[PDB]
C-alpha cells in the first residue's frame, strides 16, 4: 500500500531490476561465523555431496541436507513477514537483523510481532502519532 513517515518502515520499496537475473536458480544458504547465514552457489553436485562456494569465493565440499534454498529479495525490508516464501532458518535471520538496524524495532511477524529492544527514548510515542491513530483505517 501507500507509505507514511518513520513509524512504518521504508514501505514504498523499489523493485531494483539488478536483483532479478539472480533467480536462476541454484543459490543457497551457507553457515558463516561473521554474519551467520550467507549466500552460496551450487557450482557442481557430486550426487549426495556438493561443491558450494560462498560470497567469499572459497570452494567447499558440503553434504546435501544443509543446503537451505534462497528466498528472493522480493521480501526485503517490508512491514510484515507474511510473504517470505522459502521458510528455512536463514531466510528469516537476515531479514529481522536488518529491520532493527533500519530503526524499525517492532515488526509484524503476524499478530505475534517481533520487537528488538532499542533501549533509547525514541520520539515515536508523541501525540502526533497518538492524534492520527484514533480508530484509524
Amino acid at each position: 500500500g501507500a507509505a507514511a513517515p518513520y513509524l512504518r518502515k521504508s514501505e514504498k520499496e523499489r523493485l531494483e531490476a539488478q536483483t532479478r537475473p539472480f533467480d536462476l536458480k541454484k543459490d543457497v544458504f551457507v553457515p558463516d561465523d561473521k554474519q551467520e547465514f550467507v549466500k552460496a552457489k551450487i557450482v557442481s553436485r557430486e550426487g549426495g555431496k556438493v561443491t558450494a562456494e560462498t560470497e567469499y569465493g572459497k570452494t567447499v565440499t558440503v553434504k546435501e541436507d544443509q543446503v537451505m534454498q534462497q528466498n528472493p529479495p522480493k521480501f526485503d525490508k517490508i512491514e510484515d513477514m507474511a510473504m517470505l516464501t522459502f521458510l528455512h532458518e536463514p531466510a528469516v535471520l537476515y531479514n529481522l537483523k536488518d529491520r532493527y538496524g533500519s530503526w524499525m524495532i517492532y515488526t509484524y511477524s503476524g499478530l505475534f510481532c517481533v520487537t528488538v529492544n532499542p533501549y533509547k527514548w525514541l520520539p515515536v510515542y508523541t501525540p502526533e502519532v497518538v492524534a492520527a491513530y484514533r480508530g484509524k483505517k
Binding site: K34, Q35, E36, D80, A82, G101, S109, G110, L111, Y119
Partner: protein, 48 residues
C-alpha cells in the same frame, strides 16, 4: 546494555530460539487485524 548496537552471534542464536521460524510459517496467513462482521457488513452496504 548499549543502545543501537547489535551482535550477530547472540541474535543468530536468539532467532533460532524464540520459535521465530515456525512462528512465521503459521503466522504468515495469521490475521493481525480482527473486528466484527456485523459492522463491516453494515458499514460497506451500498458499495455494490
Amino acid at each position: 546494555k548499549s543502545p543501537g548496537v547489535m551482535d550477530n552471534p547472540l541474535v543468530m542464536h536468539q532467532l533460532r530460539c524464540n520459535g521465530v521460524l515456525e512462528g512465521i510459517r503459521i503466522c504468515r496467513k495469521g490475521f493481525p487485524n480482527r473486528i466484527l462482521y456485523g459492522d463491516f457488513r453494515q458499514r460497506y452496504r451500498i458499495l455494490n
